[PDB]
């Protein structure tokens, strides 16, 4: 049974070197706050246990099953799920010992998204591998990661990719942590233009005299179509505890501008019905509504230049498992 | 075949003590009614045929397969479907017979949310580990929760969490009970503010003349824009034989309100169409809409702050399994 | 090799005691035609063969691996998919013989909804447990239903559950009969309220006079919001083959009426601007349309209170396997 | 090892006797041109070396596992996937040698759906099981089908089914073939009847004068309803490369008719707002659009009566697998 | 052991002739990035180990299971999931040494579409097959592809299927490269020509007068057809970070120029209210409209005519895993 046991390194713990390629980040799901990649781990280390005399074995190197020696059980605290592309791997070791273990794997780990700045958000995902059968006495990592992603034309770019080792560590454990740029352009077109170009129709249609009937329908079916773009926009976009997106605040405001614009209207319009003052109300109220249209804009500039996504860390993260 | 049999404690039933690591709760899907989490059991007990001498054996802890010797095979109830993301997990035992597993797996839990007070919905969420194969005289199971949850800018927020052991089992079993709070608030931007923003555009286009052509327009359009808003709203939410969320009520009766008035003006300018009666009679149902739209915010705060949702205790939670 | 045998009974079969545990019923899809729920079986016989003696074994029960001893090998006709939360059971054998086997599934099977009355259909789901590896001379069950369901506020409830056993079978089989009952509020809140409104609001504008503009657009932009709350409603509902919702056949026959009020007053504007004939035909078709409306609903009424869903029996419920 | 070879017939193949029961068909998706059913294979073959003397062994039927003798590996050439609901099932064998393998399978097979005729399409779908580890001089198969289908009242009624042996094989493989005829009203009241509703309603609505501002919106609102009508159409079909629904066509003639009719009414009201000409140009178009609708509706009924899918056959199918 | 070590073929590495049969690519995800496809490959090579005495096994060919023998584990760099049809599959060797494995499998790799040109987009897809476990210098792989599609009658057709050999190499492997070509009218007909139909119709538009009542609902009703149509569009397409469809650019300035032709309608409209100049301007503006769509209209087709998608290669196409 000493045959599954950890290799003895003796008073040092045993030094497994991995090397982790990123073959693929495929996935990138906010509103589930999700991130699934795909990893290639390259596991090397010493078993002088399995050394064999290259006189009586020509060959210099074989392959043995996962379940005939030791091998360092990965396991992923953040991955919702992980799919193994091989079920009973293989660990090739040569004549010296050295041990290495191919592992595929696709996971979807849990990414904590900054969408402050949606639809550019910048955010960091971690990947933590724990041996959690194992203790930091016994086994040491040391991770190497390699940018080696296959498909670069995606909404979310990874740009930076490091690994660590956390020290102070009673369950051996490696951290791979990414970054992820959003340069989709399918929000922006599809949100933000037609509602600027909405809220420029409005303003524009402000200029329509107030006893005119072509007014207020006109009002009203900018008011629908804003309606639906941000019930599109809203259900487009996940909801924070606190670090919620600007862009659904911006819509919000937008939306009052919008609804208070056509109840002016309607109520001046009909309070004329019933130069006369309503016209001079409308007037003033149409110079207030752009100076304010403008001042929003500004004002919401200003607020992503001086935004900040403060939220607090997490209990896992304040505390991550194994430490101490 | 005797390895893979519980340890006996003596007269006393045996021990088993469990940690529970909540990694993070990542769906909530109120219209499947579940709750999916992450969960890492450290379950650790003594089994004395497994220690050895020191002096035999130099290493001070061996890992055995899952299957070479007895360990609780934990089954939960409400878990719709269970992933162990260790297919094939090792246990650590030590010299003195102490033997520690560590379990990583996701599940699929069915939660009864109190939707009562949706988008503010506070729910309790239990998990229960049974162990079935088992008998309570021969297994005690000792539960500690640890609150490491990974991702916290979520909808919805887990604060509390604790851990119990049913009295008087028949099937040993332990429930981890966490409470869940609704803080998203992408459901109230994307309905609550629209429909109250529509609601008073009603009310001030009531304010147009009887006999006016943009009033009737302008009624309809609006009426058109809340259906397409309750409609998104009711498919946005699930429904309960008893205890149905109140905002669905709200916003039925809301249509009602719209629909009322539209066909307050229809009629009445119709009937215009063939100061006079009708005009009067719109200036008292403005009047009457308006006194009626404040006392249905009013009656609808009140019943907000004196709702009871008393659906009662469903025949699996009122039994649970394995009792007496 | 005999240990994996069937335990012989002598001439009469061999009698396994099956308890059913319905721990929840979360999924129950109309346009997939699928019911997904919960079960836990504890399986019961007597295998003298596994009986020893006590004097040399104090344990007076044990725990053996689900391929060291005959289990019956359950199989599901109607279930699209089985996941069994045990991937390994084990069976808990005491000195006398009794093994007792517990198993914790969950499946998704296939149940023929009877959606004549949706949105209150009424429905009969039935799983039937085979055991296609023996034959009923040789194996015999005992089927006991516990209804312990977790979840009870759900659209649909359970309200009758029971077991049989087919007689006259080859293939010792047992089945688990459930009914279930829609009290969703959702559909009806959702589609119908609104389109009764709707209905309402056009039989309203029927009023209006039809030498005024405000009349035809009215009209059509109704005729809109239902043609979308129709399209809504035939993508919420699935389609069978011969009995069909009434609620599309209601809803096709509003949206038909609708669109007949429209085209009527198109047509009689327009012949108008080519008391006058029109207008005298507008009065005549608006209270015929008033009655029309009346008498619909009425027949409608009639028709749901003797309605009759007479669909025939599909092959395999006419001709079970493993029968005869 | 040679327990686990095929049995020898002598110069003949072995011959398998195949019995498939369709338990249910229960997804057809057009979309995804798949198909998903549930099945049970029952295969019976001859292994002499299996026997037994009876004298020897009381019992006449015993249960081996599937790794333990020779088995076929049945595999599927359309299955997207196939989940086996038994993992490890058992074969049944007697003292005579016969052995008896049941297999509950579910399968999503990929069919060639002819959807020339939608939503009254009819299709043929295939399920090829081929023995792909072994060579036809070795083994035979010999198919029987039962139409056991115990969900009836679905869109899709599978009314043929038949079995038959691809002469001149290589592998050894039997078909499955079955015919799938689309029932569903769904479609067609939730698109035809608004579409014919909508056309009908244009063509009434061409009725009213030219110079009337009531026209243009009518036509306009109509043609929103019939551009989101369409858009539901084609969001809810297929496109293939040749052979494409009739309905997406006749919908995109109905749509170019609607607006070549809403761009008529606003060109001449222009023109006339700039008996007068354009006035009997507009009575002209009236009577030349409703005869093309007429002739339009003609001409599809025709081309439906006439229609011809001639699609080439795919090369897996015009060469399939394992042939001379 | 040395059962399961790789055959020595001497000082060059084994040789493994592989067949490749794409039985069908039944899904292309463009949201996604995705492609998934079915391949049955055909893995034959020579092991003289297991080369048996024809006269004391008169068997010509045997199986056996799969980890009895060497086998290549195959894994796929771009595949998202992997399924293997045959979870224990068998090899079939003959008397002469000659090992042939079959395995059947369905996989979803990530292919980097070229959507410049959608929906006539043309993309190159690869899946590469990398032997891990095994080094060049012991293991060589020839690559043949059969074209035995069995669905032809799909949105995107494969006409193009290629095998190579990267050279070069450490990790032993073999690419299948196929190209994909995109043949849906459902795109078109859905987007292209009630977009194309409503530019149309607002350019006629634009000749109503410029103080009609009947333009300006006119147009809005135009708009926010056209805005609903874009959002669907967008909706239905992905984004990329460089190289972005051609047709959400064009939808976007389709949707500018319907913005700009409002806005002008509405401050013309206004200002006329508050030959006169802003009739002028107004058909100024007509003339410069039509001017500009036909414009537009031609340097659209001109840069499509001359698009370059030059998006750079992924880090893992450029570097290749298991190169130099
Ligand atoms: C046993 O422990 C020693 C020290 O912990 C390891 O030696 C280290 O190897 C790494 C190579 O990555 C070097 O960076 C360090 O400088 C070395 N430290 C010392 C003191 O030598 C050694 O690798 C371990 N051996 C095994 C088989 O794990
Ligand atoms: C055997 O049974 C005894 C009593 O049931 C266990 O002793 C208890 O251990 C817990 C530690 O969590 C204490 O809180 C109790 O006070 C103890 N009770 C007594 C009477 O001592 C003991 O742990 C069990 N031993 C094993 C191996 O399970
Ligand atoms: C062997 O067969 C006999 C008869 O089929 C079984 O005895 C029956 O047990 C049930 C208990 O549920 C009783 O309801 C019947 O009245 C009994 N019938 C008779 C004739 O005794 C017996 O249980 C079977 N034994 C085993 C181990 O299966
Ligand atoms: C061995 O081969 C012979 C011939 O191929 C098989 O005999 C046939 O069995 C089928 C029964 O379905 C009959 O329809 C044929 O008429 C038979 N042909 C002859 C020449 O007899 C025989 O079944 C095979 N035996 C086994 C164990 O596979
Ligand atoms: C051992 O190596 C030699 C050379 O690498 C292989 O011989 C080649 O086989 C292929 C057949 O596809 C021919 O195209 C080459 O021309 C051959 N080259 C030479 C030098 O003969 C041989 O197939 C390998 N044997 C095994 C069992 O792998
Ligand atoms: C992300 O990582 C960078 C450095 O790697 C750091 O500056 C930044 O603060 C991090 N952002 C968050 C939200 O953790
Ligand atoms: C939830 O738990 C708290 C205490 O833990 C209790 O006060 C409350 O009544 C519970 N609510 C429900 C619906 O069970
Ligand atoms: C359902 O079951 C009840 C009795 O259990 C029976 O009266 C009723 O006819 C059944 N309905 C259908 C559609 O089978
Ligand atoms: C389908 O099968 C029938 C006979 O079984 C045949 O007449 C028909 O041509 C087939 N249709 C197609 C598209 O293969
Ligand atoms: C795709 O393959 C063809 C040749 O096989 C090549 O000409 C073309 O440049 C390739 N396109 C891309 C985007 O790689
Ligand atoms: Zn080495
Ligand atoms: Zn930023
Ligand atoms: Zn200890
Ligand atoms: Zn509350
Ligand atoms: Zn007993
Ligand atoms: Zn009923
Ligand atoms: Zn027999
Ligand atoms: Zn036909
Ligand atoms: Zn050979
Ligand atoms: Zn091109």
């Given at each position: 049974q000493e045959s599954i046991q950890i290799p003895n390194n003796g008073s040092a713990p045993l030094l497994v070197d991995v090397r982790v390629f990123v073959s693929n980040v495929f996935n990138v799901d906010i509103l589930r706050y999700t991130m699934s990649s795909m990893l290639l781990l390259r596991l090397s280390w010493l078993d002088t246990r399995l050394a064999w005399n290259t006189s009586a074995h020509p060959r210099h190197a074989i392959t043995l099953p996962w379940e005939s020696l030791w091998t360092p059980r990965l396991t992923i605290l953040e991955a919702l799920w992980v799919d193994w592309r091989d079920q009973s791997p293989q660990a090739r070791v040569d004549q010296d010992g050295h041990v290495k273990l191919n592992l595929a794997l696709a996971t979807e780990t849990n990414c904590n998204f900054e969408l402050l700045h949606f639809p550019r958000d910048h955010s960091n995902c971690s990947?933590?591998?724990?041996?959690?059968?194992?203790?930091?006495?016994?086994?040491?990592?040391?991770?190497?990661?390699?940018?080696?992603?296959?498909?670069?034309?995606?909404?979310?770019?990874?740009?930076?990719?490091?690994?660590?080792?956390?020290?102070?560590?009673?369950?051996?454990?490696?951290?791979?942590?990414?970054?992820?740029?959003?340069?989709?352009?399918?929000?922006?077109?599809?949100?933000?233009?037609?509602?600027?170009?909405?809220?420029?129709?409005?303003?524009?249609?402000?200029?329509?005299?107030?006893?005119?009937?072509?007014?207020?329908?006109?009002?009203?079916?900018?008011?629908?179509?804003?309606?639906?773009?941000?019930?599109?926009?809203?259900?487009?976009?996940?909801?924070?505890?606190?670090?919620?997106?600007?862009?659904?605040?911006?819509?919000?405001?937008?939306?009052?501008?919008?609804?208070?614009?056509?109840?002016?209207?309607?109520?001046?319009?009909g309070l004329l019905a019933r130069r006369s003052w309503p016209e001079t109300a409308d007037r003033i109220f149409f110079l207030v509504y752009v100076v304010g249209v403008l001042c929003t804009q500004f004002v919401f500039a200003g607020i992503w230049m001086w935004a900040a996504c403060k939220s607090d860390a997490a209990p896992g993260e304040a505390a991550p498992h194994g430490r101490r």
């Open positions: 990947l933590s591998f724990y041996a959690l059968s194992n203790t930091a006495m016994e086994l040491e990592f040391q991770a190497h990661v390699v940018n080696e992603i296959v498909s670069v034309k995606r909404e979310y770019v990874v740009y930076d990719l490091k690994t660590q080792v956390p020290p102070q560590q009673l369950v051996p454990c490696f951290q791979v942590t990414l970054r992820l740029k959003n340069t989709a352009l399918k929000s922006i077109i599809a949100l933000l233009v037609p509602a600027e170009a909405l809220l420029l129709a409005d303003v524009c249609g402000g200029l329509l005299p107030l006893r005119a009937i072509e007014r207020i329908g006109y009002k009203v079916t900018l008011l629908l179509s804003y309606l639906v773009l941000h019930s599109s926009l809203v259900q487009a976009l996940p909801s924070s505890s606190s670090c919620n997106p600007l862009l659904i605040y911006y819509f919000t405001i937008l939306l009052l501008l919008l609804f208070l614009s056509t109840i002016e209207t309607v109520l001046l319009a």
